[PDB]
Write a protein that binds this ligand. Structure first.
Ligand code: 9RF
Ligand code: B7G
Length: 266
């Protein structure tokens, strides 16, 4: 079915183009200083963070605690908005919308963080990360300087992102990769596992064909990406352990209810 899969792919790419605020194409043009007549405002210390908050780049956040917790809250806000986009992306996939509504929630529940860290790589380079829909750039050094434990959260995502970005995927590749992360039969408590497994396999087959066409000189790209899916599960496991520790030890720190639900029983 060499051409049913091409149509399938184009539909998933269109769902992606329609629902994600930041594409990798856009992200990389910003990060190489070739997108606007003004660069992103660089946040690298307390003073620039404060300037960014005074309308320079940017509220409904919880009551201010301190700098490390403030950044933690902004990470939560960003995560909530990316979860919203991922849900619309998934719903824009017909095979997803026909599943048990409770299976839809199960797939999102166990898939969004894997997808988030995959997409994170698109707005990351070795020196920092885009924020505020590209209008700011927060430095990796600044994040390293936060108070423990908050300074340990993000550093592992940088390590993953730089290796992942070496594969030089584009948005059409990423649309299928994310779709495969969400439509995953290994997720606990699925009601119709064979139905999800068949969609997953269709997506992976589409992805394999897409890569042959899109990257014809890349050797072993498909099995490399499967390994990255495995790596993303470990990355999320470690992230969840750090979140657990923050919930245990940082009891002044507020936790968004949607995100607390996602982590409940993992
Ligand atoms: C704690 C946490 C981290 C991540 S890493 C991806 C990132 N997202 N936003 C980030 C950010 C936004 C703004 C700034 C500022 F500009 F303020 F400095 C700095 C960083 S970094 C993902 C989820 C997380 O916790 C929610 C969860 O686990 O659901
Ligand atoms: C973004 C803030 C979200 C706060 C989440 C911190 C606590 O989550 C807990 O993490 C465990 C997985 O490691 C689950 O097994 C627990 O049921 C759940 O309560």
């Amino acid at each position: 079915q060499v051409a049913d899969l091409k149509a399938f792919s184009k539909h998933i790419y269109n769902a992606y183009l329609k629902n994600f605020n930041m594409t990798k194409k856009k992200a990389r043009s910003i990060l190489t200083g070739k997108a606007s007549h003004t660069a992103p405002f660089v946040i690298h210390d307390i003073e620039t963070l404060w300037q960014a908050e005074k309308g320079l780049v940017w509220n409904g956040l919880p009551p201010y605690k301190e700098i490390s917790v403030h950044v933690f809250y902004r990470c939560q806000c960003t995560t909530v908005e990316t979860v919203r986009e991922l849900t619309e992306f998934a719903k824009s996939i017909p095979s997803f919308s026909s599943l048990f509504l409770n299976d839809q929630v199960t797939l999102l529940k166990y898939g969004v963080h894997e997808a988030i860290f995959a997409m994170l790589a698109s707005i990351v380079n070795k020196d920092g990360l885009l924020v505020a829909n590209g209008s700011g750039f927060v430095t990796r050094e600044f994040l390293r300087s936060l108070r423990k434990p908050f300074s340990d959260i993000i550093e592992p995502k940088f390590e993953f992102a730089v290796k992942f970005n070496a594969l030089e995927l584009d948005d059409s590749d990423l649309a299928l990769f994310i779709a495969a992360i969400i439509l995953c039969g290994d997720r606990p408590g699925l009601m119709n596992v064979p139905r999800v497994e068949a969609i997953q396999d269709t997506i992976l087959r589409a992805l394999e064909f897409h890569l042959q066409a899109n990257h014809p000189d890349a050797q072993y790209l498909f099995p490399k990406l499967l390994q990255k899916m495995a790596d993303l599960r470990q990355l999320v496991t470690e992230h969840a352990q750090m979140m657990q520790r923050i919930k245990k030890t940082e009891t002044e720190t507020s936790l968004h209810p949607l995100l607390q639900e996602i982590y409940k029983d993992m």
